[PDB]
């Protein structure tokens, strides 16, 4: 995020980091329950990648994080790689997350819910802060 | 390269019709645009949440997807529109 600010630690408890086996953060995701993470299809997750829950500072060794293995990757069958449309994948975890003060789920909308233009929302992540 | 500490930003939703002034025919019905407000999502944010409060609870409205190759803060970012995708989520969870 360019021109954002640091979050309060633990205040976005559904936010996960997707890391490869070398420990490199490459995408975010969101917990929707103890067993399932939502992310983007174009992130290209495999079962060799790791879901890291409960993280705030990726440079700290002292945080009580959960490193969760991925059992199966469910890419939406309507994902179109040419247009990047329907850009959603579900990850089924091999090991359930343990919910706590710093790890818990985001709500899903109903298909008929309305979010009007002009509404102020929030996004979070460990993406670049400058290009 | 990526920040060590988790970042946040508030930003407004756009309509798809208005987002098309920036991105043209690249904007599909399963996308929602947000930003152009002095902040931007950027590389490494992909897959993470765009949440809006609804009846007191944070609700997943978008999944960070794509946008400007320079993360321009005057151009809207593009997010996967979760309302268009939630039936597939529910079907997948129920079957697995």
């Amino acid at each position: 995020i360019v021109n954002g600010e640091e979050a309060v630690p633990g205040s976005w408890p559904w936010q996960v980091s997707l890391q490869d086996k070398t420990g490199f953060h490459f995408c975010g995701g969101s917990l929707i329950n103890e067993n399932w993470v939502v992310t983007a299809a174009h992130c290209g997750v495999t079962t060799s990648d790791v879901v890291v829950a409960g993280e705030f500072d990726q440079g700290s060794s002292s945080e009580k994080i959960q490193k969760l293995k991925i059992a199966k990757v469910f890419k939406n069958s309507k994902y179109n790689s040419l247009t990047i449309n329907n850009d959603i994948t579900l990850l089924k975890l091999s090991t359930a997350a343990s919910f706590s003060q710093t790890v818990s789920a985001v709500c899903l909308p109903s298909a008929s819910d309305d979010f009007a233009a002009g509404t102020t929302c929030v996004t979070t992540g460990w993406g670049l802060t400058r290009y | 390269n990526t920040p060590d500490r988790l970042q946040q930003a508030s930003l407004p939703l756009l309509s798809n019709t208005n987002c098309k002034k920036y991105w043209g025919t690249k904007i599909k019905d399963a996308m929602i645009c947000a930003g152009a407000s002095g902040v931007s999502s950027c590389m490494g944010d992909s897959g993470g949440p765009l949440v809006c409060k609804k009846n007191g609870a944070w609700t997943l409205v978008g999944i960070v997807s794509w946008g400007s190759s320079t993360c321009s803060t005057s151009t809207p970012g593009v997010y996967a529109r979760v309302t268009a995708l939630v039936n597939w989520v529910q079907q997948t969870l129920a079957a697995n």
Binding site: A40, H42, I84 | W23, M43, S46, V64, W66, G67
Partner: peptide, 4 residues
């Protein structure tokens, strides 16, 4: 454009 670029994937994010």
């Amino acid at each position: 454009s670029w994937p994010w």
